[PDB]
Amino acid sequence: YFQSESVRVVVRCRPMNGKEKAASYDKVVDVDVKLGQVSVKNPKGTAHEMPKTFTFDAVYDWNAKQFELYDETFRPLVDSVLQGFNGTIFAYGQTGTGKTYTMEGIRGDPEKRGVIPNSFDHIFTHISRSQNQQYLVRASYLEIYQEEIRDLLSKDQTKRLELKERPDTGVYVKDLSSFVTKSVKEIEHVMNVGNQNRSVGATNMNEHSSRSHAIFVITIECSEVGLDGENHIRVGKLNLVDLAGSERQATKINLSLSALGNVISALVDGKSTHIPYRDSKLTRLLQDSLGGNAKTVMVANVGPASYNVEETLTTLRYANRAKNIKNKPRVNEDPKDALLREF
Amino acid sequence: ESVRVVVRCRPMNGKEKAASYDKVVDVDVKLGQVSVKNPKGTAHEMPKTFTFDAVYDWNAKQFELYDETFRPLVDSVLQGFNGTIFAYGQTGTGKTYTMEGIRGDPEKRGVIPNSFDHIFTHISRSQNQQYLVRASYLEIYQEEIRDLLSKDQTKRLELKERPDTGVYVKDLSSFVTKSVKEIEHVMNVGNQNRSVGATNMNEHSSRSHAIFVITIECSEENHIRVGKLNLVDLAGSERLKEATKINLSLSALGNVISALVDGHIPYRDSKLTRLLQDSLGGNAKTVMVANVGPASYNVEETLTTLRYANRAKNIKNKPRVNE
Numbered sequence: 038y039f040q041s042e043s044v045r046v047v048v049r050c051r052p053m054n055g056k057e058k059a060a061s062y063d064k065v066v067d068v069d070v071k072l073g074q075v076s077v078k079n080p081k082g083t084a085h086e087m088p089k090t091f092t093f094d095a096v097y098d099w100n101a102k103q104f105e106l107y108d109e110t111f112r113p114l115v116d117s118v119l120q121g122f123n124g125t126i127f128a129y130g131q132t133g134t135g136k137t138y139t140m141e142g143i144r145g146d147p148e149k150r151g152v153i154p155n156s157f158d159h160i161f162t163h164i165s166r167s168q169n170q171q172y173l174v175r176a177s178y179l180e181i182y183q184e185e186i187r188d189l190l191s192k193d194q195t196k197r198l199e200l201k202e203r204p205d206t207g208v209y210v211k212d213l214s215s216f217v218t219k220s221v222k223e224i225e226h227v228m229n230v231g232n233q234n235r236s237v238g239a240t241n242m243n244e245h246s247s248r249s250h251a252i253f254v255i256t257i258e259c260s261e262v263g264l265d266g267e268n269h270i271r272v273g274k275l276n277l278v279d280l281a282g283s284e285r286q287a288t289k290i291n292l293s294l295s296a297l298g299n300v301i302s303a304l305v306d307g308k309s310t311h312i313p314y315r316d317s318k319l320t321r322l323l324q325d326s327l328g329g330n331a332k333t334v335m336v337a338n339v340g341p342a343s344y345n346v347e348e349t350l351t352t353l354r355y356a357n358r359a360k361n362i363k364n365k366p367r368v369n370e371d372p373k374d375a376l377l378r379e380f
Numbered sequence: 381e382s383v384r385v386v387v388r389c390r391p392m393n394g395k396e397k398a399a400s401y402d403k404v405v406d407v408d409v410k411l412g413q414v415s416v417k418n419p420k421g422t423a424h425e426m427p428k429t430f431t432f433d434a435v436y437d438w439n440a441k442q443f444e445l446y447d448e449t450f451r452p453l454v455d456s457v458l459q460g461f462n463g464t465i466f467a468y469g470q471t472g473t474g475k476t477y478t479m480e481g482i483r484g485d486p487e488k489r490g491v492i493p494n495s496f497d498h499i500f501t502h503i504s505r506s507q508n509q510q511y512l513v514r515a516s517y518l519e520i521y522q523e524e525i526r527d528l529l530s531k532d533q534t535k536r537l538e539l540k541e542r543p544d545t546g547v548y549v550k551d552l553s554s555f556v557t558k559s560v561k562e563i564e565h566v567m568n569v570g571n572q573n574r575s576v577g578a579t580n581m582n583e584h585s586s587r588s589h590a591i592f593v594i595t596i597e598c599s600e601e602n603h604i605r606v607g608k609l610n611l612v613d614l615a616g617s618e619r620l621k622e623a624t625k626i627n628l629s630l631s632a633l634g635n636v637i638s639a640l641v642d643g644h645i646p647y648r649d650s651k652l653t654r655l656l657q658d659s660l661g662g663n664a665k666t667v668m669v670a671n672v673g674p675a676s677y678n679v680e681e682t683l684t685t686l687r688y689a690n691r692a693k694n695i696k697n698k699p700r701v702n703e
C-alpha cells in the first residue's frame with residue numbers, strides 16, 4: 038500500500054416532528070454517537086423481527102448542531118478544496134428528513150445555517166487570513182429535473198444545457214453561467230437568485246424541489262509563488278448537492294437517483310463490473326465524486342418515525358454500501374482552465 | 381392593448397467625449413427607430429435597428445416626452461384605468477432624469493412632477509366630478525419593501541391579497557394630497573428617507589427600485605372609479621458574470637416578460653413582479669421607457685437594453701375602467 042481514500046458517509050437523524058407526535062408514531066431509529074451506529078427497530082418489535090444496525094464514519098442524532106456537523110465532518114472536505122482538491126458533499130434521503138435543512142439551513146443564522154453557508158464563511162475567512170496567496174472564487178448553481186440541466190443563475194430559465202466531454206476537459210456543462218464572488222455577501226446573493234429562479238414553474242416548490250436535484254458549485258482558484266519561485270495555480274471544485282427525495286425509486290422513478298444507486302452498488306460489489314456513469318446527468322456530472330478524482334462526503338438524512346421505517350432502511354442500506362467506495366483524489370495543479378492565469 | 385415602449389438616448393457626456401468614444405446610437409423620430417452602428421460602417425456591417433412606439437434623442441425635452449407619450453397614460457388614470465410608467469436601462473443612462481428630473485428648472489422636471497401638475501390642473505378644471513388623490517412612496521431593495529414615508533426606516537412591509545382587488549402593500553402609509561404642493565412634499569419626504577443607512581447613495585439608488593404610487597378616485601347612477609398610477613424608477617440593468625449587479629426583482633421581471641411573450645407567469649416570485657402584475661399582462665395600461673446612452677464603450681449593454689425593450693412591446697394587457 039501507499040499511504041486512495043474512501044467516500045466518507047455520515048447519518049443524520051432529525052427530531053420527531055409535531056405531525057409525527059400528533060399521529061402517535063413510535064421512534065424506531067436510535068443513534069449511538071459514541072459508536073457511530075444507527076439501529077432501526079421493526080414497528081412490531083422483536084415479536085416479528087430483530088432490529089437492524091449499521092455503522093458509519095460518524096452519526097448525528099436529533100440534538101446535533103449545524104456548526105458541530107460542519108466542524109467535525111464538512112470542514113476537512115472544504116479545507117481540501119481550499120488546497121486544490123475536488124470535493125463533493127451530497128445529502129441523500131427521504132423527502133422531509135432534512136437534506137435541505139442540512140445543506141442550506143437558515144441562512145443569515147449562525148446557529149441554524151447549513152453546510153453551504155458555513156462553507157462560504159469558512160472559505161472567505163480563510164482567504165482574508167491568507168498571505169502571499171491570490172484566490173478567485175466563483176459559483177454556479179444548476180438543477181437536474183427530468184434528465185435535463187437548468188442553469189438557475191441564467192437570465193433564460195427556458196434553456197436546457199448539455200453535458201459535454203473532451204480528453205482536454207473531463208465532463209462539463211456547456212455554457213453554464215458563473216458569478217465571480219469576492220465576499221460572503223456576494224455568494225449568498227448568488228444563492229438567493231438561483232433559489233428564486235428555481236421556482237419559475239407553477240408546481241409548488243415543495244413538490245418540485247423533492248423531485249429534482251440542486252447542485253451549487255464553488256470553484257476556488259489559488260495562485261502562489263512556491264519555494265521554486267514559479268507561479269503555481271491550483272483549482273478545486275466544491276460540489277454541494279441536495280438530492281431529490283430517495284422515495285422516488287413509471288415517471289415516479291427518478292433516473293438520476295436510480296443511476297446513483299446502480300453506480301454505488303457496482304463500485305462496491307468487489308468485481309470488475311461496468312460502472313454505469315453515463316446512465317444519468319447526475320452520475321455523469323458527479324463521476325469523479327464516485328470512484329474518481331475527488332474527496333466526497335455523503336450525508337444520509339433519515340427521520341425517526343415508525344411510519345417511514347421502510348424508506349429509512351432503504352437510505353441506510355445505500356449509505357452502508359457507499360462507505361466502501363474508493364476514490365483517488367489529487368491536487369489539481371496548473372490546469373489549462375484557470376482564470377487566475379489572466380493576471 | 382399592448383405595453384407601449386419608447387426609447388430615450390441621453391447626450392454624450394464630457395468623460396465619454398474626453399475618452400474619444402464614438403457616438404454609435406442614431407435616432408430616427410420619423411420611423412420611430414433607433415439604430416446602433418458599427419464604427420467601421422456599412423461596408424463592414426449593417427447597423428442593428430429597432431422600432432418602438434416612440435423614440436427620443438439627446439435633444440428631446442421632458443415636456444416633449446410628456447405631451448407625446450406620458451400624457452395619454454396619465455389621462456387614462458384620470459378616467460379610472462390603472463396606468464404604469466417604468467424606466468429601464470443601464471446605470472447612468474437617464475432613468476432618474478426621466479422619472480424625477482431636476483427641480484430647479486421647470487423645464488427639467490421629469491414625468492413624476494409633471495404628472496402632479498397635469499393631475500391637479502385637470503381636477504381644478506373639472507365640472508360634475510369629485511376627485512380624491514392619495515400618494516404612497518416605497519423602495520424595493522434586496523427583495524424587501526421599505527415605506528419611504530414612515531418615521532421608522534428599519535421596518536419592512538409584506539404583500540397581502542384581497543379576493544377582488546388583489547395585491548397590496550400591508551401597512552403602507554398613504555397621504556391624502558389636495559394640491560401639487562402637497563404631493564411634491566410627499567416626494568421630497570420620501571427622497572430624503574431613501575438615503576437613510578446608505579453607504580454610497582449613488583450605488584444604493586442604482587441597486588434599488590423606487591415606486592411612487594398615485595391613487596386617483598373620482599365620483600361622478602353614482603360612479604366611483606379608482607385608478608392607480610405607478611411611477612417606477614428601476615435598478616440598473618462558461619458565462620462569467622459579476623455578483624455585484626445581481627438584482628432579484630429584475631431577474632423576476634425578465635422571467636415574467638419572457639413567459640408573457642413566449643406563446644405559468646411567475647408573478648409571485650418577487651415583490652416587484654407581484655406589485656407590477658397588472659402592469660405586465662393584466663389590468664393596466666403600461667409605458668416602458670428604455671433609457672440608453674450613445675457611446676461605443678457601452679454598446680453591448682445598449683444593445684441588450686434595446687433587445688429587452690423590443691421583446692416587451694409584445695406584452696398584451698387587458699386594461700378596464702375600474703368602476
Ligand SMILES: Nc1ncnc2c1ncn2[C@@H]1O[C@H](COP(=O)(O)OP(=O)(O)O)[C@@H](O)[C@H]1O
Pocket residue numbers: 050051052099130131132133134135136137138139338
Ligand atoms: N436536524 C433538524 N432539526 C430541526 N429541524 C429539522 C432538522 N432537519 C429537518 N428539520 C425540519 O424538518 C422539515 C423538513 O426538512 P427539509 O430539510 O426541508 O427536508 P428535505 O429532506 O425534504 O429537504 C423542515 O421544516 C426543517 O426545518
Ligand SMILES: Nc1ncnc2c1ncn2[C@@H]1O[C@H](COP(=O)(O)OP(=O)(O)O)[C@@H](O)[C@H]1O
Pocket residue numbers: 389390391438469470471472473474475476477478586616671
Ligand atoms: N436626456 C438627458 N439630457 C441631459 N442630461 C441627462 C439626460 N439623461 C440623463 N442625464 C444626466 O446624465 C446623468 C445620469 O443620468 P441619471 O438619470 O442619473 O441615470 P440613471 O438614473 O439611469 O442611473 C445625470 O447627471 C443626468 O442629469
Ligand SMILES: [Mg+2]
Pocket residue numbers: 136137138246247279
Ligand atoms: Mg429539500
Ligand SMILES: [Mg+2]
Pocket residue numbers: 475476477585586
Ligand atoms: Mg437613477
